[PDB]
């Protein structure tokens, strides 16, 4: 802003319908002070705020510690007061380049004596001049007759800490209503055709995301089925619809003749393509025996599922071991 309000008239603004992008200013660290109370810039992710009050002004940095709740001192009781429960972040940066020049500035006016403490959320506007009723002058600038405001000046001899600092206090408000504005959260890339634990706008589920031809509506976000279970999701990042499917769950059956005949066995994974057999929590078991049936030369894709350890044959014989879908396994020949 080209013009800044007085120190005693700190400019108050309301920020809403947006989230502070602290990431851009995090690495840059252009401002020299990011004093956050009871919170840190990195830990703000686990917290949500609805609106912000920004109080912008120019002050002296040395006083920042002095102006705090619970301070024991008479000086702090006549400068400014803040509520004990304060959750605001003070962002302060030096501005001596533009706010300072040759000869100094005499634009700072403060108050030394006041009628009483400043009541919170209290405004007093009036053009009447207050004159002390004890020993009023009314015709001369005598005792008990002085200007209400006192000028304050800063000189070049003052150190960097004593130089004026542009300071904005951002106080985040919390209301009984549920939080609606939250800081941006890192989003992982989009993956498809593989089991994943997907968290879409707070909706958490587990399944495989695949391209869908379903036609949603502009207001519609989620999807459901006859059994009111999630079936499709509209990704907020890009305008498309992704389906959801159960990951792999099935069953494992062992087909084998009587142990008297032979010890050879075959495995049957229910209603699963053979591509997902080895990845189905295998490779962490006995190599010589189990991993042989996890993947091998002889693999058959039947309506029941995937069969490993059997060879499909042109000839058709009477059913011996029932597998299903018209397919049976026999050890003979």
């Amino acid at each position: 802003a080209t013009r800044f309000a007085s120190v005693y008239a700190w400019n108050r603004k309301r920020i809403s319908n947006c989230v502070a992008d602290y990431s851009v200013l995090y690495n840059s660290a252009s401002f020299s002070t990011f004093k956050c109370y009871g919170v840190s810039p990195t830990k703000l992710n686990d917290l949500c705020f609805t609106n912000v009050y920004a109080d912008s002004f120019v002050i002296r940095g040395d006083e920042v510690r002095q102006i705090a709740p619970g301070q024991t001192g008479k000086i702090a009781d006549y400068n400014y007061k803040l509520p004990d429960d304060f959750t605001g972040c003070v962002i302060a940066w030096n501005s001596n380049n533009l706010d300072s020049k040759v000869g100094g500035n005499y634009n700072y006016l403060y108050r030394l004596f006041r009628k009483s403490n400043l009541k919170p959320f209290e405004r007093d506007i009036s053009t009447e001049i207050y004159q002390a009723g004890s020993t009023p002058c009314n015709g001369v600038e005598g005792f008990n007759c002085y200007f209400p405001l006192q000028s304050y000046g800063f000189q070049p001899t003052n150190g960097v800490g004593y130089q004026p600092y542009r300071v904005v206090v951002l106080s985040f408000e919390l209301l009984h209503a549920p939080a609606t504005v939250c800081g941006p959260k890192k989003s992982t890339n989009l993956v498809k055709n593989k089991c994943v634990n997907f968290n879409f706008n707070g909706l958490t589920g587990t399944g495989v995301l695949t391209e869908s031809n379903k036609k949603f509506l502009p207001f519609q976000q989620f999807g459901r089925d006859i059994a009111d279970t999630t079936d499709a999701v509209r990704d907020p990042q890009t305008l498309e619809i992704l389906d959801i499917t159960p990951c792999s769950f099935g069953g494992v059956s062992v087909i084998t003749p009587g142990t008297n005949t032979s010890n050879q066995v075959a495995v049957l994974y229910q209603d699963v393509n053979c591509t997902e057999v080895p990845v189905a929590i295998h490779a962490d078991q006995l190599t010589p025996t189990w991993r042989v049936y996890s993947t091998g030369s002889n693999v058959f894709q039947t309506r029941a599922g995937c069969l490993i350890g059997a060879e499909h044959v042109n000839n058709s014989y009477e059913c011996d071991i029932p597998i299903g879908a018209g397919i049976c396994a026999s050890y003979q020949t």
Partner: nanobody
């Protein structure tokens, strides 16, 4: 006025180990903690500071490497263990709650009642 509970301190034998604990009704995970000591003839001096994540530990170079600070979120307390006690530890210790600041070593927002620590040889 914030009601903070301080445990430990008291009188301890020199050359041993000391345990201090500070508890507040407010969360400690979201707010950085600090321990400060004041003794006669000296003003406020930095002693120990721990950030929100309990990963950034700050101590005075002259006493660094002997104080271990931990934060228990379940108990919502901060514990400090001191080894190789020395007479300089005889002071009054305050536990302060606040946030992390790049400019200052620690930002103080809420002060503590304080605990007297004395060392006898």
């Amino acid at each position: 006025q914030v009601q903070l509970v301080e445990s430990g301190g008291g009188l301890v034998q020199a050359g041993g180990s000391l345990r201090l604990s500070c508890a507040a009704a407010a969360r400690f995970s979201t707010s950085a903690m600090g321990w400060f000591r004041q003794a006669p003839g000296k003003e406020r001096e930095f002693v120990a500071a721990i950030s929100w994540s309990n990963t950034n530990t700050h101590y005075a170079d002259t006493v660094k490497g002997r104080f271990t600070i931990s934060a228990d979120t379940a108990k919502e307390t901060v514990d400090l263990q001191m080894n190789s006690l020395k007479p300089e530890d005889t002071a009054v210790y305050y536990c302060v709650q606040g946030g992390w600041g790049i400019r200052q070593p620690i930002i103080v927002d809420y002060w503590g009642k304080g605990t007297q620590v004395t060392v006898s040889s």
